């Protein structure tokens, strides 16, 4: 109900199973938080100007609207998914307005480039934050540069306890522009002024999600009337409902699950484990293993049943489908709850997929904000043929059992043994390339 | 021509539009019989700046770009039922695109989105004049070595003169259409192929504007043909090479308009003395109708009428403009014109709930100009005839004066219906929409 920053409505209804999974996740996380110190983390804002690039007019009031819009959006989307209205807290002054730290870089735009705008702007943010007693390497920071397109950075990266977002200011940029239907003039993108603000501010929400540790997650068959996933193509649809263009952008339940363990969102200062490590995808990862893991083929999808070997508290599980040759934008995800013994059961589909072999990512969300992730080769079709899945049990049973237990080198040896013993058989030789690919992620 | 990633044809024209195209070309061919041939070419100018040197391979890359757009227009004109008409390029002894190099002795810091356009065209005029070419009598594509947010992406002109504006980028080439790798680090999260689609499809879109084409969106009669190039097709040009969709197609109503452009048909027809610019792109002349009746059908109207031909015409185009929408939201239908001026077309807008909608009727003359009138019409899903019948009893004199171009008399007659029967329910809703049409 905050019209001062053009608060976005909720234009989708969560599926009942995801809301039930959200409640079970928050119940588990709340028990984990009992007795742990509270978090005072805030999302800090730095405004970077340059030698021939002074601060734009009203940037303090306009970005007070922008961040409050993103803050309300995340809270409202968290609440729509079944969680409490969790969101990041801002630094407010005595008047309740957004505190923005101003930084300057003594370099002209001619001396800047697409590859240097990022690090140079963050370097200026480090200095101005340290002067105020804030360590940039231990907080989440949004760096706003007064740079144009083709020079300035639109980027985001981080994890649960540290992250950095990058965006660029523009004259009159404000969430109030979301309603404008007038066309922009003279630009390569033949698009309205309202969508242009959607790209800017919706992009900022997309980069901030990246800074919290969220990779890309596209739309799925289970949400055909919810708009575009914010961490997918939703960055370009954020606020489209205010122009009656569509359903806008929604926070995917699998992304809501991951953020529920972020201290910036839940307010609890949990400690990261010692074995946390960065991976190919955004986030912090720890080793994990399963007691059993089977993907059963169904019509246009898979039914994933398994039992996690829980050596640490976990609150949920997320299954991804990654089509070969596609980017992370093309993946779809399904979430599920975990019982105390570690059993889970979910169904993930990709209707119309003709490629047959597809990669599946199974992520276990731990209460310490980290994740354990494994990549499994699976076969899928419209009919739901069981023949490839049966060859995976008969020939590749030892490979899977070792792989889901994290024994990569032993699984490779067992994979080499079936290739040398039965590699000439047609039903075996087609599983070898997708198994070798899965064993290297 | 795979050397420049020639685009395929990903749509099939409706049979009536192809039949309309053949009848239009037959009429235009008779008009061209005995007229001098045209040597017009679309000239290309590359503008560099003080701290903005020419990008690598810009000569070979824009040889691919212009040949791609040239082949696209030819293939889309042929798909619509016309001969493979397109613009001709200036080719050297090796058959490569001739590019005129222009320089502006100003740094990029002194350029802006609003000033890059006119400053670039001025530099193009000088280098073209040095070669004996008058920019105000030809079609020119101005390419600036400028980034986004500084450089111009614009287009404007008519049948006998036009200017297109675009900006170069590192590695911009139609061969990039197939790339599915993500760009990264940009405000627009799009693949490298999508980025090239926006650049080159934009150029094709601006060139269409330079030929005299306004915006024309998609319509119900082509739901599986892709996006209209003069609508949102600028962002779908070449999408089929990534299996993203059907790409961009040239709307039959736009193909009709281009058939009278000397750059496309090769005949140097003379512009009439009464040609004038209008609210929309193109050259316009006064026109009138002997009769004009819109018959309501399901989700649309059937338009029958007879143009009062005071000059040779080869076709007619009807547009529907929903209230509150931009030019991107209009849909258009083309039709052929007989020697007496008779025409018959059907235009629909399924799902439109607004009831009252504006219709633009454009007559395409053989001298490259158009006559256009704006009519208020009513439309619904059922196809109810009641509002159109009240439109016949009242406002009868208003339409008769309006289709004869007598604006002031139509306004006076409109005030008479408001004073005599303005309280009647079947009359009072036509009054506001008629004043809007009489002022458009
Ligand atoms: Na065996
Ligand atoms: Zn991203
Ligand atoms: Zn345009």
Residue numbers in the entry:
A (entry chain B): 18 to 458
B (entry chain A): 19 to 458
Sentences from the paper on this structure:
The uncharacterized protein AMUC_1438 is encoded by a gene that was previously shown to be upregulated when the bacterium is grown on mucin. Here, we provide structural and functional support for the assignment of AMUC_1438 as a unique O-glycopeptidase with mucin-degrading capacity. Structural, kinetic, and mutagenic analyses point to a metzincin metalloprotease catalytic motif but with an active site that specifically recognizes a GalNAc residue α-linked to serine or threonine (i.e., the Tn-antigen). The enzyme catalyzes hydrolysis of the bond immediately N-terminal to the glycosylated residue.
We were unable to generate crystals of FL, but we were able to determine the structure of ALTL to 2.5 Å resolution. In this case, the last 18 amino acids in the two molecules in asymmetric unit were missing. The last ∼60 C-terminal amino acids that could be modeled, and which correspond to the missing residues in the ALT structure, comprised a three α-helix bundle resembling the Found In Various ARchitectures (FIVAR) domains observed as linkers in the ZmpB O-glycopeptidase from Clostridium perfringens. However, the relative orientations of the α-helical linker domain and the catalytic domain in the ALTL structure differ from the FL model, with the α-helical linker being packed more closely against the β-sandwich domain in ALTL than in the FL model. Indeed, the conformation observed in ALTL seems unlikely in the full-length enzyme as the position of the α-helical linker domain would likely result in clashes between the CBM-like domain, if it were present, and the rest of the protein. Toward providing support for the conformation observed in the FL model compared with the ALTL structure, we employed hydrogen-deuterium exchange mass spectrometry (HDX-MS) on both proteins. Most relevant to the FL model, however, is the increased exchange in the last two β-strands of the β-sandwich domain and the initial 1 to 2 turns of the first α-helix in the α-helical linker domain. In the ALTL crystal structure, these secondary structures are shielded from solvent by packing of the α-helical linker against the β-sandwich domain. In the FL model, however, the α-helical linker is peeled away from the β-sandwich domain, thus exposing the protein regions in FL that were observed to exchange more readily. Therefore, the HDX-MS results are consistent with conformation of the FL model.
